C-alpha cells in the first residue's frame, strides 16, 4: 500500500547520525527508483536512541533540501554537512 510521511529530528554525535543509506541516481537500491533508503541503524546511535527511523525508510528530505533524484555522493554530502541538528522527512512503507 501507500506509505506515510514522518518528520524525524536527530541530534548528531561524534560518530554521526548512526545509520547507513543506499540508493541515488546511477546507484539504484530499488528498481525504477533513485530514492535514498535506510539500510542499517547502529545500536546506541542517534537514530537508534531517537527510535523513529527504521530500516527501509526512504529519506526524501534533509532539512529543506530534497533528496529525490540526487546522486549517492550528494546524499552522503548533504547528510554529512548539516549542523548538529538534522530534520529528516521520511516515507514509511
Amino acid at each position: 500500500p501507500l506509505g506515510s510521511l514522518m518528520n524525524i529530528v536527530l541530534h548528531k554525535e561524534d560518530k554521526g547520525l548512526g545509520f547507513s543509506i543506499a540508493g541515488g541516481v546511477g546507484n539504484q537500491h530499488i528498481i525504477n527508483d533513485n530514492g535514498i533508503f535506510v539500510t542499517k541503524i547502529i545500536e546506541g546511535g542517534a537514530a537508534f536512541q531517537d527510535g523513529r527511523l527504521e530500516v527501509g525508510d526512504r529519506i526524501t528530505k534533509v532539512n529543506t533540501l530534497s533528496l529525490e533524484n540526487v546522486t549517492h555522493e550528494e546524499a552522503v554530502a548533504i547528510l554529512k554537512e548539516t549542523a548538529d541538528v538534522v530534520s529528516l522527512v521520511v516515507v514509511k512503507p
Binding site: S20, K40, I42, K80
Partner: peptide
C-alpha cells in the same frame, strides 16, 4: 553501496 552517516 552502503555509506554510513
Amino acid at each position: 553501496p552502503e555509506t554510513s552517516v
